TrEMBL record, chain A:
Family, per entry: Belongs to the oxygen-dependent FAD-linked oxidoreductase family.
Entries under InterPro entries matching the protein: BBE (IPR012951), FAD-bd_PCMH (IPR016166), FAD-bd_PCMH-like_sf (IPR036318), FAD-bd_PCMH_sub1 (IPR016167), FAD-bd_PCMH_sub2 (IPR016169), FAD-linked_Oxidoreductase (IPR050416), Oxid_FAD_bind_N (IPR006094), Oxy_OxRdtase_FAD_BS (IPR006093)
Keyword Flavoprotein: yes
Domain FAD-binding PCMH-type positions: 40-210
MF GO annotations: FAD binding; identical protein binding; oxidoreductase activity
Keyword Cell membrane among UniProt keywords: no
Co-factor(s): FAD
Positions annotated to bind FAD: 72, 74-78, 83, 112, 134, 139, 142-143, 149, 200, 415, 417, 454
Protein name in the entry: Putative FAD-dependent oxygenase EncM
PANTHER family (alphabetical): BINDING OXIDOREDUCTASE, PUTATIVE (AFU_ORTHOLOGUE AFUA_1G17690)-RELATED, FAD-BINDING PCMH-TYPE DOMAIN-CONTAINING PROTEIN
Gene: encM
A Pfam family matched in the record: FAD_binding_4
Matching PROSITE patterns: FAD_PCMH, OX2_COVAL_FAD
Keywords: FAD, Flavoprotein, Nucleotide-binding, Oxidoreductase
Length: 461, 458
């Protein structure tokens, strides 16, 4: 956190940089360096809060010239802690949050530091939307570069399936456009290849008209887990793209809609929505709500912005997290029993074992069309441990590790955006050999010195 | 047609985008939410920083261009676009910094409410603002700003601690309780009259999940619902907010199909506090008539903010008449219900709101916001799509307002329509209006900022 810093380079950077600099002696340093995964505590030499593409160019050049370890930060949600470094520079894009939306063209151009809810607000101003993740304060930047999935994905694909171009600052300080017509090698790689290839200062998306959505959330007792999970797995194998249905095994929240004797006990929280006519939606959801006895059932017809803002209603933001995730091509009865066994052991009220079903529009894109791997595996499991007290890290981490080990033979690949700080070696497996090889060649062209290595990293060559 | 060296000085000092009448994106850029207002600016300046705003303000002053300022473009009066002048468009200045420790947010003057609410809510924090996510923070806060958190935490301006503002002479000032407090008084309720606010600083509160209910009552049961509402609100704890919106029932699955498109009371309510207590409180106010299409939920505050309005449709054309009530009498109730029965467009609402609570505890002279002591607000909010039907919808709101004028006083600046320039004095009252004219004579003596509910200097 105290490297040299040639005064002339530094003075060149300062005069070229219009944003804010934050040094270790500054009052806002400690708040500035905190990211969502509170287990990651690192002290950068410097935090540069960029406010424009020229700022990012200055910060990249300054980092390269000074040999500072480069962290890039969009929303700070890295489950691996990638967006803060010890002793280097954080290129922090959090003030670059502008969105321009054309209603006529159904287009959005969004800066690299945007939060999901800010983008959703902007597009919903015109009844428009495009897929992103389900928690409003996640960053658009990291989420999109890894792929990006949420409520609209079965219908409209990953975030990267609606991305048409990026403005990107490469390690040599160049500003490039990448799209289907301009640097398409780079455009393939940023659709899935993370922050490996440079800093994206603007993303352009095609939008869709999305009016109110019929939604339901309910809880089932763990008693009924086998029949609920079998009903879910079997229904989704043939469900219309319009239906999304996700299971979250957790301790029941102390909420008035739930009976007192369920509070704090493991349950299955099922959330579902219908993207399309809300009357059809009401019939479709009613037909999946009764696979177990529903408790705490909430049904609403929501603007899409409000469905985006809904996940997940709790009283405190978890400070500490640890995740282990993989895909499955199929969810066998043995895998289902394992999931339920490990959910009965959840300790924290903030922990969830997520069972997600993608497929739909995500699976109809050709494997090779982007860097995102595993389109053909429909199931995603995520053992997402979350808690508050740092003296309990081992008990929570052990829960995620042991549930994963017990499943791992059934799992393949892994979403880069769900990797934990210890999973740097999962990168080849996540991508597979063919994608990994093509990603390396693009890395050798655009970032041959690996200036961008705080990511699920692809070494060049 | 502009002086070439002035123009060239501006362009040199300006790091944003300029949009000219010949640009393909001009027609989209110049449209505002009130689509009855169709105007053609000489130039649109899309500002990206406080130095850009300084360059635009100085360029307009020097060229003698009429200045429209645009935050979120929600002006009910159409103020955020002009014919022949310059639009200083702040929509790209959307950045927000939140301190969890100090419970503080600094937001730029072009933020939308949903961007602000997302940023605050990442820390479980919030501060009072409007109920529709894509409204502009800029215009809303400068006129006062009320919504779900107001009865508990006051108006938006009651949580504001300082602003950065660019004045008509091109200067950048801080205004707060300790620096330029005459200006700080005026910007809290005096709208965009005193300059372009480029950053707002707010105190925040911790807001976790909120119990919420929305439901629909038949107009058959209208008299007893609205009386139960006016009676209950007179003694309700700050934590309870309850609003009534008379409107055509939206075609949603929670309502039986026979009610769709017929006049109803939509009642929305929330408890800012413990969701168990919230459940008991909302139950106690949900049964004055039979609730149809009841939705009850425990929501993050961000999702409550994103929920309004049921049907989630954007109307193209709008016309509003609003004022305050000190009391809602049985006679005024009958009137409301009679006009409500005549609503034609599925987008129109006759809104009955109840502020009071924390808003009314602030001394009347602490800010430029008038009528803290009148708890009721009615807003005849006509909205429609077809340009050939303007006159019928406009007449609905005018005739309802006329029919209730014996009960109505003042008016919220932020609910004024484009024909209501004459209503400014009655809105503020003599004393406030006179104080505001003196602040205008000091900070905007040439009235460079006159596309607003305008306060002439002197
Ligand atoms: C509460 C929560 C909910 C989530 N829900 C979902 C979900 O529903 N679906 C889903 O797909 N994912 C989800 N995620 C995962 C999210 O996709 C990853 O955590 C993603 O990396 C977050 O991006 P960010 O910008 O917030 O993170 P950061 O930590 O800022 O960055 C993550 C990575 O991206 C790089 N990066 C960030 N922005 C840029 C940019 N503009 N240019 C170049 N590189 C950049 C960083 O260098 C780092 O490698 C969620 C995460 C959280 C914390
Ligand atoms: C659909 C809808 C829902 C609404 N709900 C509510 C609500 O729940 N509560 C409530 O209080 N109000 C509400 N309003 C009204 C809102 O307060 C006013 O329409 C407000 O003026 C909107 O501000 P804006 O920046 O979007 O509008 P704009 O049209 O961009 O501007 C409005 C006025 O403010 C000036 N201005 C805007 N930003 C700045 C700035 N940064 N500096 C200086 N001057 C500026 C403009 O010159 C103009 O006079 C709502 C409006 C709409 C359209």
């Amino acid at each position: 956190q105290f490297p040299q810093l040639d005064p002339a380079t530094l003075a060149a950077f300062s005069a070229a940089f219009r944003g804010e600099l934050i040094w270790p002696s500054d009052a806002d340093y400690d708040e500035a360096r905190r990211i969502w995964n509170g287990t990651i505590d690192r002290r950068p030499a410097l935090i540069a809060r960029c406010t424009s593409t020229p700022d990012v160019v200055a910060a990249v050049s300054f980092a390269r010239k000074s040999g500072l370890l480069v962290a890039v930060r969009g929303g700070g949600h890295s489950m691996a802690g990638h967006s803060v470094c010890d002793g280097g520079i954080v290129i922090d894009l959090s003030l670059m949050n502008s969105i321009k939306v054309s209603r006529r063209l159904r287009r959005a151009r969004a800066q690299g530091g945007c939060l999901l809810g800010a983008f959703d607000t902007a597009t919903q101003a015109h009844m428009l939307a495009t897929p992103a993740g389900v928690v409003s304060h996640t960053g658009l930047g990291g989420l999109v570069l890894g792929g990006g999935f949420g409520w609209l994905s079965r219908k409209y694909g990953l975030s990267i399936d609606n991305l048409t171009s990026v403005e990107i600052v490469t390690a040599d300080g160049g500003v490039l456009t990448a799209s289907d017509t301009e640097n398409p090698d780079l455009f393939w790689a940023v659709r899935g290849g993370g922050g490996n290839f440079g800093v994206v200062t603007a993303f352009e998306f095609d939008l869709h008209r999305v009016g109110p959505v019929r939604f339901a959330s309910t809880y089932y007792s763990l008693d009924e887990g086998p029949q609920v999970i079998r009903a879910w797995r079997d229904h989704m194998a043939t469900a219309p793209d319009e239906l999304t249905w996700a299971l979250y095994l957790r301790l029941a929240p102390p909420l008035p809609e739930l009976p007192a004797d369920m509070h704090g006990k493991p349950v299955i929280c099922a959330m579902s929505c219908w993207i399309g006519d809300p009357h059809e939606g009401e019939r479709q959801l009613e037909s999946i709500l009764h696979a177990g006895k529903p408790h705490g059932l909430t049904k609403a017809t929501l603007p899409y912005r409000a469905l985006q803002a809904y996940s997940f209603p709790g009283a405190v933001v978890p400070d500490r997290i640890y995740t282990k995730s993989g895909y499955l091509n199929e969810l066998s009865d043995e895998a289902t029993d394992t999931v339920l066994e490990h959910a009965a052991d959840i300790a924290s009220p903030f922990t969830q074992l997520e069972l997600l079903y993608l497929g739909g529009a995500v699976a109809r894109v050709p494997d090779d069309a982007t860097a995102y791997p595993n389109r053909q595996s429909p199931f995603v499991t995520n053992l997402a441990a979350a808690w508050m007290d740092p003296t309990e890290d081992a008990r929570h981490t052990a829960w995620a590790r042991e549930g994963y080990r017990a499943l791992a033979g059934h799992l393949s690949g892994g979403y880069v955006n769900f990797m934990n700080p210890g999973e740097a070696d999962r990168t080849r497996e996540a991508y597979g050999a063919a994608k990994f090889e093509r990603l390396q060649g693009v890395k050798a062209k655009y970032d041959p010195t690996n200036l961008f290595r705080l990511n699920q990293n692809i070494p060049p060559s």
